[PDB]
Design a protein around this motif. Structure first.
Motif, short mmCIF file in Angstrom:
data_model
loop_
_atom_site.label_atom_id
_atom_site.label_comp_id
_atom_site.label_asym_id
_atom_site.label_seq_id
_atom_site.Cartn_x
_atom_site.Cartn_y
_atom_site.Cartn_z
N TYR A 35 0.83 -1.19 0.00
CA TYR A 35 0.00 0.00 0.00
C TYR A 35 0.87 1.25 0.00
O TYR A 35 2.05 1.22 0.38
CB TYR A 35 -0.93 -0.02 1.21
CG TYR A 35 -1.94 -1.15 1.14
CD1 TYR A 35 -3.07 -1.03 0.35
CD2 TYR A 35 -1.74 -2.33 1.84
CE1 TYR A 35 -4.00 -2.05 0.27
CE2 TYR A 35 -2.65 -3.36 1.77
CZ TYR A 35 -3.78 -3.21 0.98
OH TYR A 35 -4.70 -4.23 0.89
N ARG A 36 0.29 2.37 -0.42
CA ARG A 36 1.03 3.61 -0.64
C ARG A 36 0.47 4.74 0.21
O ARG A 36 -0.75 4.94 0.28
CB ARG A 36 0.99 4.03 -2.11
CG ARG A 36 1.38 2.95 -3.09
CD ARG A 36 2.77 2.44 -2.79
NE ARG A 36 3.26 1.59 -3.86
CZ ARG A 36 4.23 0.69 -3.71
NH1 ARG A 36 4.79 0.52 -2.52
NH2 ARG A 36 4.61 -0.04 -4.75
N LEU A 90 -3.91 6.24 3.29
CA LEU A 90 -3.48 4.93 2.83
C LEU A 90 -4.51 4.37 1.85
O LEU A 90 -5.72 4.49 2.08
CB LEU A 90 -3.29 3.95 3.99
CG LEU A 90 -2.41 4.39 5.17
CD1 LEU A 90 -2.25 3.26 6.19
CD2 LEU A 90 -1.06 4.88 4.69
N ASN A 91 -4.04 3.78 0.75
CA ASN A 91 -4.95 3.21 -0.25
C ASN A 91 -5.43 1.82 0.13
O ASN A 91 -5.48 0.93 -0.72
CB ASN A 91 -4.28 3.20 -1.63
CG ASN A 91 -3.07 2.29 -1.68
OD1 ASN A 91 -2.47 1.99 -0.65
ND2 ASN A 91 -2.70 1.85 -2.88
N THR A 92 -5.75 1.61 1.40
CA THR A 92 -6.43 0.40 1.81
C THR A 92 -7.89 0.46 1.40
O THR A 92 -8.39 1.49 0.93
CB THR A 92 -6.32 0.19 3.32
OG1 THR A 92 -6.73 1.39 4.00
CG2 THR A 92 -4.91 -0.18 3.73
N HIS B 44 -11.03 10.70 -0.72
CA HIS B 44 -10.22 9.56 -1.12
C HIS B 44 -9.66 9.80 -2.52
O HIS B 44 -10.42 10.01 -3.47
CB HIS B 44 -11.02 8.26 -1.10
CG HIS B 44 -10.20 7.05 -1.41
ND1 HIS B 44 -8.83 7.03 -1.27
CD2 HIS B 44 -10.55 5.83 -1.87
CE1 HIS B 44 -8.37 5.84 -1.62
NE2 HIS B 44 -9.40 5.09 -2.00
N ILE B 45 -8.33 9.76 -2.65
CA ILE B 45 -7.72 9.83 -3.97
C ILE B 45 -8.03 8.55 -4.74
O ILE B 45 -7.76 7.44 -4.26
CB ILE B 45 -6.20 10.04 -3.87
CG1 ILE B 45 -5.88 11.34 -3.12
CG2 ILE B 45 -5.60 10.02 -5.27
CD1 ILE B 45 -4.40 11.50 -2.78
N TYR B 51 -2.75 6.20 -13.60
CA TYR B 51 -2.43 5.41 -12.42
C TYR B 51 -3.64 5.31 -11.50
O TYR B 51 -4.39 6.27 -11.32
CB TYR B 51 -1.23 6.02 -11.69
CG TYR B 51 -0.99 5.50 -10.30
CD1 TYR B 51 -0.18 4.39 -10.08
CD2 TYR B 51 -1.56 6.13 -9.19
CE1 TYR B 51 0.07 3.91 -8.81
CE2 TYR B 51 -1.32 5.65 -7.90
CZ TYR B 51 -0.51 4.55 -7.72
OH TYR B 51 -0.28 4.07 -6.45
N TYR B 53 -4.84 4.68 -7.69
CA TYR B 53 -4.46 4.65 -6.28
C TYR B 53 -5.40 3.79 -5.43
O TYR B 53 -4.93 2.95 -4.66
CB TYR B 53 -4.42 6.08 -5.73
CG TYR B 53 -4.04 6.17 -4.27
CD1 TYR B 53 -2.77 5.81 -3.84
CD2 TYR B 53 -4.95 6.64 -3.32
CE1 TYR B 53 -2.41 5.91 -2.50
CE2 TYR B 53 -4.61 6.74 -1.99
CZ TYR B 53 -3.33 6.38 -1.58
OH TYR B 53 -2.97 6.47 -0.25
N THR B 54 -6.71 3.98 -5.56
CA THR B 54 -7.64 3.25 -4.70
C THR B 54 -7.48 1.74 -4.89
O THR B 54 -7.14 1.26 -5.97
CB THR B 54 -9.09 3.66 -4.99
OG1 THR B 54 -9.98 2.79 -4.30
CG2 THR B 54 -9.40 3.59 -6.49
N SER B 55 -7.69 1.00 -3.79
CA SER B 55 -7.71 -0.46 -3.80
C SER B 55 -9.07 -1.03 -4.17
O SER B 55 -9.20 -2.25 -4.25
CB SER B 55 -7.32 -1.02 -2.42
OG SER B 55 -5.94 -0.88 -2.18
#
Ligand SMILES: *[C@@H]1O[C@H](CO)[C@@H](O)[C@H](O)[C@H]1NC(C)=O
Ligand SMILES: *[C@@H]1O[C@H](CO)[C@@H](O)[C@H](O)[C@H]1NC(C)=O
Ligand SMILES: *[C@@H]1O[C@H](CO)[C@@H](O)[C@H](O)[C@H]1NC(C)=O
Lengths: 205, 107
Positions: A35-36, A90-92, B44-45, B51, B53-55
């Protein structure tokens, strides 16, 4: 690599620095894995950086990490417009985020337009000595005789008050005697170094 | 000249629940800035350029080179997805273009 998501270890510290000094926000995480860490300005939503890629074209903004748990956002030579909240993200799934806040203080600085120059006045006259100052938080101005003697404050009704210092932007001296001539110092201070001081010579003939 | 948004870019989009939602964002003079999608309710980005970012694997941004459109796609649209979204150009300070998504059921 197994399924348990990263967590914040501690909150983002609020930061307060003077204009032109460097500010760093740090995001402490654990088990970040793949994660980033993202950064953005909370009020404008402006994206600052993701992982090691700075996204903003603000040249004063950069990033680094001490280790995989310690992610920094650096704002170089802070300005008034950098004031606000900075979001670590966090991109969780779902996303997790924290906000720290930057306060931009300004050391005192005189306004030359409304600060008194050296003045020569007849005895018994009234004089306004003024030192206007700017800064954040708002500076307070203190007057002192340079020789340590007391400032003489008078009313219209015949009473004089002797103070070693006077707090206020305008020092009003009335019905002045020769004893009051000398060097007056106004000091503008707001807890944000350096303090600023001007020397004003009062001549009474 | 600085980048800007095509003002014809729709500010109000309506998708069907269970289907894909498409939010367009036409940009001129992008130069070396990036176009990013942000979801407002939690800031939320989502995407930065192409690209992701989100999961949330339902999201993808596509650069339509012919129209200079940075389109956001949301698969399996749900009522929860409705709300405000931001298309954002990485100028300093940033340019933002607000787009509202609606998720409804046919008829
Ligand atoms: C930071 O300062 C803001 C006020 O600007 C305050 O609301 C917030 O609680 C502070 N955060 C911390 C972690 O102290
Ligand atoms: C957005 O579109 C929906 C459906 O077409 C409509 O009900 C709503 O009024 C629109 N919003 C605005 C602000 O026009
Ligand atoms: C984008 O282009 C400008 C052109 O002057 C340049 O100064 C800047 O460094 C470039 N930024 C990046 C991230 O390449």
């Amino acid at each position: 690599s197994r399924a348990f998501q990263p967590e914040f270890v501690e909150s983002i510290s609020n930061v307060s620095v003077a204009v032109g000094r460097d500010a760093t926000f740090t995001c402490h995480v654990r088990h970040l894995g793949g994660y980033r860490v993202g950064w953005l300005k909370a009020d404008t939503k402006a994206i600052q950086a993701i992982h090691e890629n700075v996204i903003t074209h603000n040249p004063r903004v950069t990033v680094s990490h001490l280790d995989q748990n310690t992610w920094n956002l650096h704002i170089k030579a802070v300005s008034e417009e950098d004031r606000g909240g900075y979001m670590c993200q966090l991109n969780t799934d779902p996303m997790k985020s924290q906000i720290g806040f930057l306060d931009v203080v300004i050391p005192p600085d005189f306004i030359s337009e409304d600060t008194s120059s050296d003045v020569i006045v007849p005895e018994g006259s009234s004089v306004r000595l003024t030192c206007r100052a700017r800064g954040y938080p708002e500076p307070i101005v203190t007057w002192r005789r340079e020789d340590g003697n007391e400032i003489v404050l008078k009313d219209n009704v015949g009473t004089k008050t002797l103070a070693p210092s006077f707090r206020g932007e305008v020092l009003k001296l009335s019905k002045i005697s020769r004893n009051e001539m000398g060097s007056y110092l106004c000091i503008a201070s707001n807890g944000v170094p350096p303090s600023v001081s001007k020397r004003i010579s009062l001549s009474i003939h | 000249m600085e980048p800007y948004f095509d003002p014809s870019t729709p500010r109000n989009v309506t998708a069907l629940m269970g289907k894909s939602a498409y939010l367009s964002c036409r940009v001129r003079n992008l130069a070396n800035k990036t176009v990013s999608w942000i979801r407002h309710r939690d800031i939320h980005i989502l995407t930065v350029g192409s690209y992701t970012y989100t999961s949330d694997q339902r999201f993808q941004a596509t650069h339509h080179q012919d129209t200079e459109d940075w389109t956001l796609q949301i698969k399996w649209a749900q009522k929860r997805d409705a709300g405000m979204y931001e298309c954002q150009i990485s100028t300093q300070p940033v340019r933002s273009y607000f787009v509202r998504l609606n998720v409804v059921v046919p008829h």
